[PDB]
């Protein structure tokens, strides 16, 4: 008798209900400084909660590990029951999405990256390739002058029809060592890479809340990352 796969029977939301697995690949090039690096970890979007643990495979990391915690998967967003014909990134699953950005940092460079986020297997899979340019060698970020810490922040979002997809726009608040604040511009669109249909949700925002720490046993370049996503605004 016939077998059927996974995938060959469910779509969107339902490949959530669990505990997923994340793999996250990112490729960088920053002011001429190439690095990469590996993350994985768990998402559970039931709760909205995901754990993740980056290594720079390539040494030292040239840039301070909050500035790529945005950069570093909204489908684990814990959306509302009154929310469901909202949740965009869910709805584009298996398949999965394009999510770009432009990140500009205030008084210093810009990021720029393109990521697919999408499953392999079934692994949640986050590959990233992101290029900055025009950072100040001084600059708070190349001169690794930021506090490892990470504040919470809402990502507002509305929908993007003409291209089927998604937009959204925050600023993140980066603390800084000498009591400053370093500020960093997000711009961001979202467009499923398959061709089924996807939800197109009313403006709404996802709240952020981030935990960065470290494991003393690691001697690589390394950050412990736990986030909380919740969806709200309807």
Do not use: I, Q, S, T
């Given at each position: 008798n016939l077998y059927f796969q996974g995938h060959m029977v469910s779509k969107g939301?339902?490949?959530?209900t669990g505990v997923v697995p994340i793999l996250v690949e990112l490729d960088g090039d920053v002011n001429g400084h190439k690095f990469s690096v590996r993350g994985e970890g768990e998402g559970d979007a039931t709760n909205g909660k995901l754990t993740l643990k980056f290594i720079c495979t390539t040494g030292?990391?040239?840039?301070?590990?909050p500035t790529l915690v945005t950069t570093f998967?909204?489908?684990?967003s814990r959306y509302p029951d009154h929310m469901k014909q909202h949740d965009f990134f869910k709805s584009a699953m298996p398949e999965g999405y394009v999510q770009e950005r432009t990140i500009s940092f205030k008084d210093d460079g810009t990021y720029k990256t393109r990521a697919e986020v999408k499953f392999e297997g079934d692994t949640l899979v986050n590959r990233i390739e992101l290029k900055g340019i025009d950072?100040?060698?001084?600059?708070?970020i190349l001169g690794h002058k930021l506090e490892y810490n990470f504040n919470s922040h809402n990502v507002y979002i509305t929908a993007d029809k003409q291209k089927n997809g998604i937009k959204a726009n925050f600023k993140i608040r980066h603390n800084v060592e000498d009591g400053s604040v370093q500020l960093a511009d997000h711009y961001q669109q979202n467009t499923p890479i398959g061709d089924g249909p996807v939800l197109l949700p009313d403006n709404h925002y996802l709240s952020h809340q981030s935990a960065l720490s470290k494991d003393p046993?690691?001697?690589?370049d390394h950050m412990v990352l736990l986030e909380f996503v919740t969806a709200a605004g309807i």
């Open positions: 939301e339902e490949l959530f030292k990391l040239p840039v301070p590990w998967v909204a489908c684990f950072f100040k060698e001084d600059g708070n046993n690691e001697k690589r």
